Paper text:
In humans, the CALHM family encompasses six paralogs, some of which function as non-selective channels that are permeable to large substances such as ATP. We identified the three paralogs, CALHM2, 4 and 6, to be highly expressed in this organ. The CALHM subunits thus constitute unique modular building blocks that assemble with different stoichiometries into large membrane channels. In contrast to previously described CALHM structures, where the oligomeric state of individual channels was described as uniform, our data show heterogeneous populations with CALHM4 and CALHM6 assembling as decameric and undecameric channels with similar abundance and CALHM2 as predominantly undecameric proteins with a smaller population of dodecamers. Despite the unknown activating stimuli, our study has provided insight into gating transitions of CALHM channels by showing two conformations with either a cylindrical pore of uniform large dimeter within the membrane that is constricted at the intracellular side as in case of CALHM4 and a conical pore that continuously narrows from its extracellular entry towards the cytoplasm as in case of CALHM6.
In each case, we found a heterogeneous, about equal distribution of particles with two distinct oligomeric states. The smaller particles are composed of decameric and the larger of undecameric assemblies, both of which we refer to as CALHM4 channels. In each structure, the subunits are arranged around a central axis of symmetry that defines the ion-conduction path. Both assemblies contain pairs of CALHM4 channels of the same size related by two-fold symmetry that interact via their cytoplasmic parts. In the plane of the membrane, the dimensions of decameric and undecameric CALHM4 channels amount to 110 Å and 120 Å respectively. The diameter at both entrances of the pore measures about 52 Å and 60 Å for decameric and undecameric assemblies respectively, thus defining the properties of an unusually large channel, which could be permeable to molecular substrates. Even at the constriction located at the intracellular membrane leaflet where the respective N-terminal helices NH project towards the pore axis, the decameric channels are about 20 Å and undecameric channels 30 Å wide. In our data, we find strong evidence for a layered distribution of density inside the pore within the presumed membrane region in non-symmetrized maps and after application of symmetry. This density is observed with similar properties in decameric and undecameric proteins in both datasets of CALHM4 obtained in either absence or presence of Ca2+. Collectively, our data are compatible with the presence of a lipid bilayer located within the pore region of CALHM4 channels, which could interfere with the diffusion of charged substances.
Author numbering:
A (entry chain D), B (entry chain E), C (entry chain F), D (entry chain G), E (entry chain H), F (entry chain I), ...: 4 to 83, 94 to 280
The structure:
Amino acid sequence: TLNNIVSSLQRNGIFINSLIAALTIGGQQLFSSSTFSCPCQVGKNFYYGSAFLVIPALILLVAGFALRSQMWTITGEYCCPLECKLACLRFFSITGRAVIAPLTWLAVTLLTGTYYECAASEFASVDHYPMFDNVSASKREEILAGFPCCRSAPSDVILVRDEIALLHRYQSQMLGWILITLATIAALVSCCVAKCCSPLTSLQHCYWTSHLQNERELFEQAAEQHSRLLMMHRIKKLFGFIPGSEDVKHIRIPSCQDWKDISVPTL
Amino acid sequence: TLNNIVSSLQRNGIFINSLIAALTIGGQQLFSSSTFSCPCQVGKNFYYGSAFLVIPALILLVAGFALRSQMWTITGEYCCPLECKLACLRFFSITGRAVIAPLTWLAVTLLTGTYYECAASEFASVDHYPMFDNVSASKREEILAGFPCCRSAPSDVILVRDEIALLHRYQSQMLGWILITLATIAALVSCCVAKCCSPLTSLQHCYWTSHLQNERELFEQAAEQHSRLLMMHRIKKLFGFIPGSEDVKHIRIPSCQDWKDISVPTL
Amino acid sequence: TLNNIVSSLQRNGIFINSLIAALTIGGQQLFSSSTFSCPCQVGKNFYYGSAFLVIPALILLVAGFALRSQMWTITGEYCCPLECKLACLRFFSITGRAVIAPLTWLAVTLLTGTYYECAASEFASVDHYPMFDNVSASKREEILAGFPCCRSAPSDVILVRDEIALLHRYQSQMLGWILITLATIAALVSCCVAKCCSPLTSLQHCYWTSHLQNERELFEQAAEQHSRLLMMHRIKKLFGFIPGSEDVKHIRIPSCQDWKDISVPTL
Amino acid sequence: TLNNIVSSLQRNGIFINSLIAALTIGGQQLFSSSTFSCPCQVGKNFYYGSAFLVIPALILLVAGFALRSQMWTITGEYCCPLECKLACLRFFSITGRAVIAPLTWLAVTLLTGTYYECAASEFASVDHYPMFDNVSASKREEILAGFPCCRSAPSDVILVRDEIALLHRYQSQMLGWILITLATIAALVSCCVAKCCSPLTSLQHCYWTSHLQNERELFEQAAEQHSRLLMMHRIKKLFGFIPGSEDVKHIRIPSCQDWKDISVPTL
Amino acid sequence: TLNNIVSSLQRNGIFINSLIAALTIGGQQLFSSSTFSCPCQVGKNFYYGSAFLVIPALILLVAGFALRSQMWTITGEYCCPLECKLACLRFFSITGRAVIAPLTWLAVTLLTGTYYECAASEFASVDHYPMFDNVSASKREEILAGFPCCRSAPSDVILVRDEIALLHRYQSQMLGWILITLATIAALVSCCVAKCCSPLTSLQHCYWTSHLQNERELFEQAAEQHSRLLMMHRIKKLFGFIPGSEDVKHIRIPSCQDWKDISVPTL
Amino acid sequence: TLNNIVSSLQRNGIFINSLIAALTIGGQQLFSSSTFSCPCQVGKNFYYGSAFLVIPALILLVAGFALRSQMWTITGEYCCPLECKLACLRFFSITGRAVIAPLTWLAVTLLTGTYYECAASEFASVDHYPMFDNVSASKREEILAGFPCCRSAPSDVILVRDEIALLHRYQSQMLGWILITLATIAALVSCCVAKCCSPLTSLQHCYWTSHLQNERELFEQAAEQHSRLLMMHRIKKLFGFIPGSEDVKHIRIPSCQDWKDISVPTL
Amino acid sequence: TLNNIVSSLQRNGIFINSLIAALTIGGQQLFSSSTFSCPCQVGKNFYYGSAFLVIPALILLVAGFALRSQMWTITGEYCCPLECKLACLRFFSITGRAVIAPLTWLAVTLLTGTYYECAASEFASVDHYPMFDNVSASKREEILAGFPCCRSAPSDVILVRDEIALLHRYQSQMLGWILITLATIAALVSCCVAKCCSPLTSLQHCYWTSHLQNERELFEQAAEQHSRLLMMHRIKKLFGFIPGSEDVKHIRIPSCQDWKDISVPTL
């Protein structure tokens, strides 16, 4: 009874998407907890933030796109009427699967926010504080970029540090919620538009998806079996018996040329 | 039902590649934690870094290439039209499998970064620090190369030490992210180019892969069975019965020459 | 289903080689942890190092070579055209199996390095240290060879001790990596050369290996069964019945000479 | 399926030899840890060392030789052409089995070395030490033989004690490695010589071993069954029925003489 | 499958002998640890040692001899040509089984040695000690026999006590090793002599042992079954039915004399 | 398969005797540990010792004799040629079983010895001690009998107490070993004499024992079944049906006299 | 297979008697530990001892006698030649079963002795003690009866208390051993006398016991089944069908008198 429930969940898109999201959340948490430390350098902080904020998104997005077998076939159809719209719908479905990873990564990393504070710990507009009046500009940059990582200064400095940190965390979390709401509204309007521009009815679509999936599977199985049978026939012509046999009473010794013959694969 | 799922995962490339990457991560972590210590010598530091940074990459890459059985056959075809392009595609697929190990090793070792700081702990451009003004050049080299391993000096020295360490860790992690992004973009463009220059359709390719795999397997099985039968026939001609038999009622004692005859293997 | 997977792994060379390497690593670790202590004598240190460094390599190599049954048969063919090349290929395959143990022993013992420091704790070139200027030569040897095992001297002495130890550990680990890289490149070029000089195709080789293995096994089984049947016939001629029988209704009492007759084995 | 794997390992010489070696290692460790203490007497130390070093070797060697059933038969053939060489090969194989125990005992006891220091704690050549100049010869013997077991003297005495102990441990371990290497090289050259002087081919030898083993087993079984049947017939002649019977309808009461008749065993 | 392995081990002499030795070692250890304390009397010490040293040997030896069923039969043959030599061989085999217990008891008790020191704590030749010069002879006996059990005297006394104890332990262990080596060499030469003087071949001996064992077993079973059948027939003659029966339709009431008749056993 | 091994051990005398001995050892230990305390009275100590030393022996011996069913039958044969000797052999075998308990009780209680010291704590010959010179005789008895249980006196008194205790423990243990050796030698000589004076051969004896045992068992079973059948027939004559029946279609109501008839048992 | 071993043990008298004895020991221990405290009154102590010493014996004896079903039948035979002797033997066997409980209770309670000291803590003959000279008689009774339970007086009083307690415990244990030995000798002589005066042989007795037991059991079963059948027939006559039936096709409604008829049981 196992394989029944296995296939049932494997078809169920909700479970697969939820598992992907959970995996990305856990991986992000472990990653951030292990190998993250703000540089607290002079001008090389914003890059160290932006990298961790963005690059994983691009990587996971490209990976989630390119790993889908159907996308390669669609590109091959495209690379050097109704077929165009159907290709667009196919591509859109694969996109709807693949987008789940980068958006959830961005969401969790903005909500925890510990990345963003390092990303923009230098842009804090300081104009209404007593300790930043007389000090030099470069001295201000130095004392400003050192805030996130450590603290050893007097009380007022660590208090203004706490204040800047809270402000930046607020900004990060608001930006995260904005990203979530915009992503959701865009996904909804896009799915509705795709359902609108579809040339098929509410029933031909399901038939079509089943057609595609079962086509791929059956053709794979058939090609495998056919090539196996043909290679088996060549083997039997060479040695004199079918390999899957038993108690064979006839054996043909090969000639010093038959090896040369079987060398080519006939493609 | 076991062997079904075993073969299913064994065909699945994603699981194999993920397992390889996890194994390399764990092995690298154990290795670095056990047998690594910066030399803190005068000029013999950069080599001690570069070795651990590079040599495992070359070793694992050559091992992941040479261990693939098909690569030896392709080289034999090459060593002393359509066949050339097909060989190129075969070689490219094996490469796509083998490259996973060295790149993940480099990635994890640069991201942890503890190797790179030892690799280039001497190249730190020191020009704007108060304790490196009057001191001699060789004295500067000595005091500079001692930073990574230990600390016993006054406060200002350990502070400039912490600063150099943070700078170098930042450089290492940025270099790592650059390596990852370049590797990914190169892999993607290369796979797309390979799919472009392919002379086969979206269906002949799958048939072709199944052809290759099943060809290898079936020919192995057939050759084994055929040689077994032939050796069995020689044995029965010598001793007078088939070995796989039971309740044999006839035995032929060998002559002092038959041993000389069976000595040769007929190749 | 057990014996299926047992035979599958038993044919798989990768698993066997990996198990051998793991066993050697564990054994080396236990050995070194239990029965190793630097002599700290005057001139009898280098030998105590070199023994543990080398002798296990020779022992394990000779054991891994001589224990392979096929190597004895090949030597018998050699000891007092195509057969020569085939013998060379057979010997090379057995070598490829046997070399795994000594090289991994050397690798792990050099990487841990605790052997090498005792091996060459006397050759340290001391010329730029303040405490080795006025002291006598033999006094220098005495104070130099005592470094690895214990420490009771003032601070400067234990510091120069730590420095010599770090230098020697660095040298050991670099030598180990050099050994690994040279061994790998040599193994690769040698395997490629062997595949080049081979007179057989990519298919005759597999057939040939299966031929050898099944030949050995079947001949063993057949010889056993044949000798069993012949001895059974002699027994039945003597006592008057086949031993594997039941409810025998005839018994022949032996004569005082029949014992003398059955005494010889007929070889 | 149990008895299959049991017989498979029972034929496998490697596993049996490895188990013997492990058993001897464990037994030696327990023995030494429990019942060993240096006498620290005047002239009765060297014997107490040599006994534990040697006598177990002789005992285990004689036991491993005499316990092999085939060795008794070979001696009976010897005790009051081709047969001589075959006997030599048989004896050599049994020797190759039996030698594993004493050599591993010597190896482990020399490598731990705690025996050797007690064995030769009196022969230490003391000529360059300040506390052994004026003291009398017998006083020197007394103070020298007391080193291994206990320590209560001032610092310089316990330091020279530590030094003598380290020297002697070094000597013991080197002697052990020498014994191992010489034993291995001798075993290898001897096995090669035996394979050289053998009059049989690479195939007759296996047939011969199977002949010997199956001969012994089958003759044992047949003799047992035959004697059982004969005794059963005598019993049935006496009492009037076969013992292995059931529902016997005839009983013969013995006479006061039949007991006298059955008294003799007919040999 | 249980009874197969049970009989296999039960025939295997090595396992039985090893179990006997282990049992004697454990029993001796428990015994000595529980109920042993040196008397420290004047002249009644040597006996208290010798008893524990010897008497268990005699007891275990006589028990291991007399408990073997075959020894009683051999004595009955002896008590009031070839038969003599065969009896000698039978007796020798039983001896080879029985001797294992006393010799291992002596060995373990001498090696631990705690018995011997109490056995001869009075014979210590004291001539070169300062505290035994002026003291009276009986006073010397008193102070000498008190050494093993307790200590309350000044330092020099307890030191000479420790020295005497170490000397005596050395003597005990050497005596033990001598006993082991002499026992082994005697056993070997005796077994070889027995194999020499044997009138039978290398094959008649095994047949003979199987003859003896199966003879005993079968005769026991047959006698049991025959007497059971005869008693069953007498019962059926008396009561009128076979006891092992069911649904018997005829019953014979006994007479007041039939009880008198069945009273005798007919021997 | 259970009942097979149960009967096998139940016939095995060695296991039964060993279990009896172990049970007696454990019971004696628990008994002595729980309910033993020396009276330390004036003249009532020796009895309190002798009771625990002896009375359990007599009780266990009489119990082990009288509980054997065969002993009652032999006495009945005796109570108001060959039969006499056979009765003697039967009685001797039962004795050999029964003697194991009292002798092991005596052995363990003498070896622990804590009973004997209380048994003869008053007979200690005191003539060479300083504190027993002037004191009165009855005062000496009082101070002597108080030794075993408690101690509150000055040092010299408790020392002479320890000395008397050690002497008495030595005497107890020697007496125990003497009892063991004499018991063993007597048992051996008695068994040999019994085997000597036996009128039967080495085979008639086993037949005879099997005869006795199976006779008893079969007669018991037969008598039971016969009486059951007869009572069943009487029941069926009374009520009109066999009780072990089912679906009986005929019932006989008893008369007011039939109850009077069935009242007698017919013996 | 369970019920076989259950019946085997249930017939075995030894196991039943041993279980009864163990149960009485445990129960006595729990009882004494829970609800016992000496009254330490003036004249009401001896009764409080004697009750716990005796009354349980009488209770358990009467219970063990009256609970045996056969004893009631024998009394009925007795209550208002050979039969007399047989009744005596039956009664004697039941007595031999029943006596085990009271005697073991008395034995364990005397051996622990804590009851007897309270029983006779007032009868201690005090004539040779210094503190009982001048004191009044009733004062002596008061101070004497307070000994067992508590202690608060000066040292000499608690010492004479300890002495009286030890004396009384000695007396209790001796009395217990006397009771055991007399009980055993009486049981033995009585059983022998019963075996002597028996009119039956060594075989008629076993037949007789089996007769009695199987008679009781079979008659019980038969009476049960017969009464069940008769009541079933009456039921079927009333209602019109056999109750143990199914699918009955005929039902007889009862009349208002049939209930009056079935009211009587016919005895």
